[PDB]
Design a protein around this ligand. Structure first.
Ligand SMILES: CC(C)(COP(=O)(O)OP(=O)(O)OC[C@H]1O[C@@H](n2cnc3c(N)ncnc32)[C@H](O)[C@@H]1OP(=O)(O)O)[C@@H](O)C(=O)NCCC(=O)NCCS
Ligand SMILES: CC(C)(COP(=O)(O)OP(=O)(O)OC[C@H]1O[C@@H](n2cnc3c(N)ncnc32)[C@H](O)[C@@H]1OP(=O)(O)O)[C@@H](O)C(=O)NCCC(=O)NCCS
Ligand SMILES: CC(C)(COP(=O)(O)OP(=O)(O)OC[C@H]1O[C@@H](n2cnc3c(N)ncnc32)[C@H](O)[C@@H]1OP(=O)(O)O)[C@@H](O)C(=O)NCCC(=O)NCCS
Ligand SMILES: CC(=O)N[C@@H]1[C@@H](O)[C@@H](OP(=O)(O)OP(=O)(O)OC[C@H]2O[C@@H](n3cc(C)c(=O)[nH]c3=O)C[C@@H]2O)O[C@H](C)[C@H]1O
Ligand SMILES: CC(=O)N[C@@H]1[C@@H](O)[C@@H](OP(=O)(O)OP(=O)(O)OC[C@H]2O[C@@H](n3cc(C)c(=O)[nH]c3=O)C[C@@H]2O)O[C@H](C)[C@H]1O
Ligand SMILES: CC(=O)N[C@@H]1[C@@H](O)[C@@H](OP(=O)(O)OP(=O)(O)OC[C@H]2O[C@@H](n3cc(C)c(=O)[nH]c3=O)C[C@@H]2O)O[C@H](C)[C@H]1O
Ligand code: NA
Lengths: 145, 145, 145
């Protein structure tokens, strides 16, 4: 089976064997999470969300409607995603922009992923990066400082 | 009335009709929150805080003493504010620096707002931006990468 | 004694007099925390962790295995650390990279600290900075925008 911490609010039944969901996580009913994932403390996972097998999501990450994470992905702590390029309070788009993080990719701590982005298989996103364009498979991308 | 999630610690009675405060939020007694706000999971809202009507605060945001948010503002997930320009542990300033986010402005995901900042009406702050100077009304500002 | 909020999950007994640990914190058994610290809401503190006296850790910070914080350090909100330079899901290093934040240093809001980093005594890290190299004692470092 899977381990849901008593201090998490997990509303999805779609959770694979071996998955751990830690304290103060929120997981909404339609989320799909595969096997042997680690969803660390203080995460939010919305409804229109698919997460594969062997995925690590470190603390303080939110996975919004329209985001797909493939197998073997690493998401660093406080990584931020997004599904709305020109956000205005209470102006809901007809369709949320889709993001996909492809198999085995890794996103460094506190990176920011713009909406509509593909991060290719086995890519490596530097800690603190802002990703405004697709990252090609196996590419190491980081922002200039 | 307003919806306070049983898993939130909300100590303020100053909360407008239609406002939702989600899991694992902390709201201290003197906070003022207007009508039809959405305060998403994992937020912290301090005492000397005013938030207007129709404000969206996405997950993982802290609103410190000295911060005012006007009506119709969007604050993206993991946006960070601040009220102390030269922080040293246990060195408390006589007065906290004030920040104001003016009506209808939007702050992108994981942006960082320095203390003493005004963001003008209907401004748009790019995801991951560092805002070290006031942003003029209706201006789109983002950091070089 | 020390104050542990009923809404925190604190598993360490190694907590100094005067320390406050706030709502929705996780502190694992082997963590060492000194006297008169303030561990603000939504923090995660792992096992192989030493935190000195009079340390301020603002909301939404994770202190991983291999991180040491000396006395009188200020860590701003949503500051991110790290202990693994080339993270891949389920590829555990033999040894985690060590970070040390030296006495009286201050890290600004939403800064990102790469693994293996020393931040010298009384340094000041700008809000939103990415720290990829050691910061010398008493130096003010911030990223170009
Ligand atoms: C991106 C990364 C993999 C690159 O490592 P690397 O290829 O060995 O690169 P180097 O350390 O040799 O640094 C090369 C240059 O890029 C810079 N750089 C490296 N990482 C950077 C980053 N994340 N952001 C901005 N600049 C970065 C260095 O400052 C260096 O600059 P210089 O040539 O002017 O001296 C690594 O630095 C990184 O960010 N890893 C992610 C860590 C993480 O978030 N882990 C998960 C949590 S523990
Ligand atoms: C700032 C923003 C509104 C600009 O959108 P835009 O005006 O259509 O700009 P474009 O996409 O045409 O990009 C223009 C250039 O600026 C760069 N850029 C855009 N947004 C950036 C950002 N946030 N940070 C750094 N650079 C950015 C692009 O890389 C592009 O560079 P190039 O000309 O060298 O190719 C948008 O990118 C953004 O950041 N939106 C906020 C998303 C968000 O946080 N939503 C809330 C959570 S879903
Ligand atoms: C880094 C810091 C201490 C510098 O303050 P300062 O030395 O007075 O520097 P100034 O305000 O005079 O700014 C000098 C220049 O650096 C830039 N700058 C300042 N802080 C910056 C930062 N954090 N990131 C990027 N650029 C920064 C300014 O834009 C200015 O640019 P300009 O010369 O082109 O106009 C301060 O800006 C800071 O980041 N403080 C941390 C705040 C914080 O996180 N507190 C804890 C939470 S409240
Ligand atoms: C800073 C970082 O992300 N490093 C990673 C490291 O933490 C570890 O990540 P992973 O999540 O896979 O570690 P684990 O050993 O399987 O599980 C430990 C994590 O589980 C989460 N957890 C664990 C416990 C016991 C808890 O109570 N609450 C909680 O959230 C956070 C802990 O860091 O290994 C990666 C390769 C590394 O990149
Ligand atoms: C990534 C992002 O911020 N996108 C926004 C999007 O999430 C949505 O934001 P908003 O908060 O207004 O959405 P909503 O549909 O009113 O409410 C859903 C949010 O409520 C919060 N919530 C909701 C539930 C059900 C919960 O249990 N816990 C919780 O925190 C987080 C959910 O994303 O619309 C914006 C225009 C968009 O910019
Ligand atoms: C934005 C920022 O970090 N400013 C700092 C400011 O918040 C304050 O930080 P400190 O944590 O030391 O403040 P405090 O007055 O000792 O304690 C108040 C903090 O305690 C935490 N707390 C407090 C209460 C009452 C709570 O319920 N939950 C909770 O997490 C967050 C509050 O900001 O002083 C610094 C010099 C300043 O740099
Ligand atoms: Na952040």
């Amino acid at each position: 089976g899977h381990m849901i911490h008593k201090l998490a609010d997990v509303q999805s039944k779609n959770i694979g064997s071996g998955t751990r969901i830690w304290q103060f996580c929120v997981v909404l009913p339609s989320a799909i999470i595969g096997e042997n994932c680690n969803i660390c403390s203080h995460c939010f996972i919305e409804n229109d969300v698919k997460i594969g097998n062997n995925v690590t999501i470190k603390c303080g990450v939110q996975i919004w409607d329209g985001i797909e994470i493939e197998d073997d992905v690493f998401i660093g702590p406080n990584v931020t995603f997004c599904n709305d390029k020109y956000p205005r309070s209470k102006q809901y788009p007809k369709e949320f922009s889709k993001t996909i993080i492809k198999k085995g990719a890794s996103i460094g701590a506190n990176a920011t992923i713009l909406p509509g982005i593909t991060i290719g298989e086995n890519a490596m996103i530097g800690a603190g990066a802002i990703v405004t364009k697709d990252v090609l498979p196996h590419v190491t991308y980081y922002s200039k400082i």
